[PDB]
Ligand binder design. Structure first.
Ligand SMILES: Cc1cc2nc3c(=O)[nH]c(=O)nc-3n(C[C@H](O)[C@H](O)[C@H](O)COP(=O)(O)OP(=O)(O)OC[C@H]3O[C@@H](n4cnc5c(N)ncnc54)[C@H](O)[C@@H]3O)c2cc1C
Ligand SMILES: Cc1cc2nc3c(=O)[nH]c(=O)nc-3n(C[C@H](O)[C@H](O)[C@H](O)COP(=O)(O)OP(=O)(O)OC[C@H]3O[C@@H](n4cnc5c(N)ncnc54)[C@H](O)[C@@H]3O)c2cc1C
Ligand SMILES: NC(=O)c1ccc[n+]([C@@H]2O[C@H](COP(=O)([O-])OP(=O)(O)OC[C@H]3O[C@@H](n4cnc5c(N)ncnc54)[C@H](OP(=O)(O)O)[C@@H]3O)[C@@H](O)[C@H]2O)c1
Ligand SMILES: NC(=O)c1ccc[n+]([C@@H]2O[C@H](COP(=O)([O-])OP(=O)(O)OC[C@H]3O[C@@H](n4cnc5c(N)ncnc54)[C@H](OP(=O)(O)O)[C@@H]3O)[C@@H](O)[C@H]2O)c1
Ligand SMILES: [Cl-]
Ligand SMILES: [Cl-]
Lengths: 443, 443
């Protein structure tokens, strides 16, 4: 009895870890094969200089850029089964850079020795369900041998993410503009925009942070523009918020303001689409980015075919944490530990969650909702319960720190909820930590 | 009886045109469906500002950039069945810009009324051959309805090109460099590199022309580097050729010279790979870019499954011309007008062509080879024969003009081989024609 895991990001890693933990406690687990299109694990967190299409011609997966740092409290994403203390030996600050959290998540799966289940440099092409044999045929392309083969599986868990395929709206005049146009996804070294004016379309995390990053590394000027509401923070002297872009010139941008500016480069921070080109409509999740996509029982079991699962397909306040709660749940249903109700009951449950999701107005209500969801997940499972209300509170502080000063929210520290140890302040304040390396952050 | 044509570029267009011509002459043709992922036809020639992944999340197909102009004599790519005179009403110069040749190729298929066979905004996902029914199942994703469906076909003609999936080699230090790194494929407006130093890796057409374009629109400095041999032309004052790049710094490039330069942006002009993610190994052509890929009988019929065809998969001296000769051939075999020999005879014939291909040393020998190939194709077919030796000679002149001056080769003019009418000189010399529009070129 055999399981396919699509992707070796945090969720892929989590799913392997879940099975490995059940085996460590002495259960008999199914056989596992995890397919990954990259040469190494970590999903988003595996940095690449590459852009658009990778060396094999697959879409480039990582949206991460130089100088990226955790954008929420470390302690809100700590593994309940593998603490920051265990991995690093010492306390560290609360907003580690990319390389640092990369090392962290790799650490857990290194210790667990699950790498052996992964076939790297292998792209998933197709997943089909065979009614007659009640199994899945997974077709993949191995770019090391340049071969396309397929295998049979009893269950499939999809962990391929939903922040990689850019949503890139068109604006009148883009075909005439003379500077670079790119999506947030293709943003790499902030230095390429030193001494330049940068338009940033959009009003969410990518806008906030890519702006910040351009500012931090010496851009002349920054302009955000928003579809519905303005971001709201107090931006430095050389950064304006204007209502939405409307058209574009050989060298200028034009807003619903009626205003005008010379612009060097436009970065579309307009989000991503859920895109699964390896799935047919019988298995393919279709949703906008949100806290409660429909058709997932407990947010992970595919309602039309419960032998297929999805991990981390929700919008994220929590992350690593959540994927774990999900992977532990998925594994337990795969292992027969948690039998599924009938299809009608699944559908009714999911509707109840959706109703509640529509109730949400404030940031606080939103992550508390994710919190309740995770709470419901971890109570069903092996997975160590931890203080969710206390994690909610940490998000609340984090929100405040951003409102106080959007350029110094990374300079604060919070209490781990696994160990209790409060985090030190970091040796360099954010604006001045120009070196982004593990090396430089840990010394 | 039903045919699938994958792609509506020049080759897709040609294939439709071939069938339509046979019907015009009163034959009964099969049913046709052509699938195209873009919103309009023209293949490479359909310009987009987009980069990496398109609005639906498909790889962006076009490699074409602002200010692109035909890089060979117009008269070497003229349709034998739809002349430049017929389309434009008047003579024009010999190196029309993108928009101009786009209008031209669209013209022929507009006149033919074949648009009706095309399902746009539809990406081909998979082609499978069913041994039992001796038919193909083609699975596509319609991005207008967001639906994935599949249809049965008796033959399939693949026209999806091989200059879209970039070959992008890695160079030590790319992960540290602070300026933009891109493939020729993502190159759009030359203005983004005004007053900048641009490294261009590679020594072929893309290197030549992207360099030229950067120069023409005011780049500070240009550096080409070559893997095997230097391009050879006399570059302007602010452009050097040096041997291959070896590593890269925060802001510098280092070559096998031992030399060093501050660099603002690197453009990889390292070519493309034949990539068919919608085919399994039974149907998937695997080759490097060359005049004679193996496994194609007469360079178009797939030897392991002769109900599957490939158009325009060869490296190109000739182009539009050749695709026609190929499409007409493909159609005549589909229509039963040209029965195929046994598999052993096919294999033997292809070997003879390969042997001769390996003989080739000089540019002249190379396009003369393609010429002999095309000659062999058009003699079997309906397709109007035209003067190939005379077209060869035109390539020869073209070669000379490039050797004389690589910046003014586009300023000469040549004799059409269809009509005999010599082409006028163009109202503006190349270096000065800053406006790239149809509008501005034809007035
Ligand atoms: C720019 C950016 C910054 C972020 N920063 C933070 C942060 O600071 N803190 C936080 O908590 N969260 C952050 N996130 C949220 C992020 O979603 C999670 O941290 C985490 O990366 C989710 O991991 P995942 O495994 O579920 O998906 P991913 O990390 O995207 O991994 C999916 C994996 O599937 C693979 N894959 C996809 N398709 C195929 C295929 N066809 N065949 C084979 N393999 C395939 C990919 O290669 C990848 O390895 C950020 C996201 C982005 C995009
Ligand atoms: C930058 C550049 C400049 C060039 N300049 C010249 C020139 O000046 N003169 C010249 O003679 N030749 C030139 N060429 C050569 C070029 O190969 C031909 O002119 C011509 O474009 C070949 O057309 P094609 O139909 O065979 O392939 P393409 O033009 O690439 O068209 C292929 C079609 O297939 C579609 N497609 C691909 N995959 C899918 C899918 N999965 N599902 C649905 N549709 C799909 C694409 O959208 C596209 O429309 C140039 C090529 C490039 C890249
Ligand atoms: N660690 C980091 O520093 C970091 C950096 C970048 C990203 N991230 C992560 O990446 C994920 C998503 O980031 P995201 O901000 O790119 O996607 P997102 O969270 O879904 O934000 C989508 C944004 O794009 C805007 N938008 C969409 N279409 C638009 C249009 N046509 N015109 C103008 N604006 C438009 C939306 O406007 P509306 O609000 O009106 O809908 C919204 O503000 C999050 O998980 C985040 O944690 C993290
Ligand atoms: N109309 C226009 O002006 C225009 C503009 C651009 C492109 N095009 C078209 O696009 C097509 C291909 O253009 P192309 O030049 O990009 O591809 P190409 O013709 O196949 O050229 C490949 C080049 O990349 C070089 N290269 C490969 N790997 C390398 C490496 N690791 N390091 C350094 N160099 C490397 C090769 O070096 P080697 O020589 O040693 O093998 C070769 O010079 C042609 O059909 C051309 O007509 C046209
Ligand atoms: Cl362990
Ligand atoms: Cl006609």
């Amino acid at each position: 009895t055999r399981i396919a895991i699509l992707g070796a990001g945090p969720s892929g890693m989590a799913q392997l870890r879940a099975f490995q933990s059940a085996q460590e406690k002495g259960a008999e687990i199914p056989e596992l094969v995890c397919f990954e299109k990259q040469a190494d694990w970590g999903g988003q967190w595996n940095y690449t200089w590459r852009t658009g299409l990778d060396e094999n011609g697959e879409p480039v997966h990582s949206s991460m850029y130089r100088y990226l740092w955790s954008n929420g409290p470390k302690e809100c994403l700590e593994f309940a089964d593998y603490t920051f203390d265990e991995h690093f030996g010492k306390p560290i600050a609360s907003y580690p850079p990319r390389e640092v959290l990369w090392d962290y998540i790799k650490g857990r799966v290194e210790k667990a020795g699950v790498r052996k289940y992964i076939r790297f440099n292998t792209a998933v092409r197709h997943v089909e369900f065979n009614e007659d044999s009640q199994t899945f045929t997974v077709t993949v392309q191995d770019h090391t041998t340049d071969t396309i083969y397929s295998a049979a599986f009893d269950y499939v868990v999809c962990c391929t993410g939903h922040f990689s395929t850019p949503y890139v709206p068109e604006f009148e005049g883009f075909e005439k503009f003379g500077g670079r146009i790119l999506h947030a996804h293709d943003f790499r070294d902030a230095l390429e925009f030193k001494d330049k004016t940068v338009l940033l379309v959009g009003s969410s995390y990518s806008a906030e942070d890519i702006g910040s990053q351009c500012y931090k590394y010496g851009a002349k000027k920054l302009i955000s523009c928003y579809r519905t509401a303005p971001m709201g923070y107090k931006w430095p002297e050389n950064w304006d918020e204007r209502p939405n872009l409307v058209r574009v010139d050989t060298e200028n941008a034009y807003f619903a303001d009626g205003s005008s500016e010379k612009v060097d480069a436009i970065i579309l921070c307009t989000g991503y689409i859920h895109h699964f080109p390896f799935l047919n409509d019988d298995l393919r999740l279709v949703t906008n980015n949100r806290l409660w996509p429909l058709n997932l029982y407990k947010g992970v079991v595919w309602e039309d075919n419960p032998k297929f699962f999805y991990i981390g397909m929700q919008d994220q306040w929590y992350s690593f944490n959540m994927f774990d709660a999900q992977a532990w749940y998925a594994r337990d249903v795969i292992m027969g530990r948690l039998p599924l109700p009938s299809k009608e009951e699944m559908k009714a449950d999911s509707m109840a969650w959706r109703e509640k999701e529509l109730t949400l107005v404030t940031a606080e209500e939103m992550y508390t909702y994710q919190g309740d969801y995770i709470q419901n997940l971890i109570d069903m499972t092996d997975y160590p319960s931890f203080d969710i209300p206390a994690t909610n509170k940490t998000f609340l502080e984090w929100k405040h720190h951003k409102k106080e000063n959007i350029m110094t929210f990374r300079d604060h520290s919070y209490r781990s909820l696994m160990t209790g140890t409060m985090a030190p302040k970091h040796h360099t304040p954010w604006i001045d930590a120009l070196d982004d390396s593990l090396e430089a952050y840990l010394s």
